[PDB]
């Protein structure tokens, strides 16, 4: 999954 705040 993908980091939201980066």
């Amino acid at each position, epitope marked *: 999954f993908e*980091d*939201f705040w980066k």
Partner: antibody
Amino acid sequence: QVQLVQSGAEVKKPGSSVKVSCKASGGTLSSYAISWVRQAPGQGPEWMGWINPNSGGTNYAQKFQGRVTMTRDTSISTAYMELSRLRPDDTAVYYCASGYCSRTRCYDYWGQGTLVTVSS
Amino acid sequence: VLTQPSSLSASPGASVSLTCTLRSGINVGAYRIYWYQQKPGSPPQFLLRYKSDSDKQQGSGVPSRFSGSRDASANAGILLISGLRSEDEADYYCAIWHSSAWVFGGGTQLTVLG
């Protein structure tokens, strides 16, 4: 991925410093970044930076460099944001937030916020 | 960098378009627009993010009547709310990653008439 619980309201004088905490409800923070966002009354959000809870590496917004410090405790249980040389215009609700995304959805985990009041 | 109308009002059941206008030069096609809803006393809650019909992500538990789109003509991202309800009354904020800082719009206060 985990719920975040913040510390209580703070009241400070100009020139002082405040340190807000952001503890994982469950004892351990996740690997995803913990961003810090503040919101002055009647205004919109303002990003301050984030920290990576495993590395401890930071990325501070330009407006707050030299004033803000973001750390983590050694058990990776709690994240901290420290702001120094406070001014009345630092008065705001300070939030921590973390989250992740599928390709279809996103899941944002916000703390309840911590009110920091700066006044003489 | 971002400009939102400070206030917007509409009737229940209406379809409303909330605009997030990016500064001249900053091309709207090269940014993924984030949208948040905030009610008094609560943190912002992520609604959705939109880059194209191809790459769009919906917030957890956010109804489908909230959708995203783009308006390249006006250099603006768009949050579409159909079937407007009284519970949609809130502040709506847009946001982008630009010059390695998260940038937020000033917010649109949405009032439901009647």
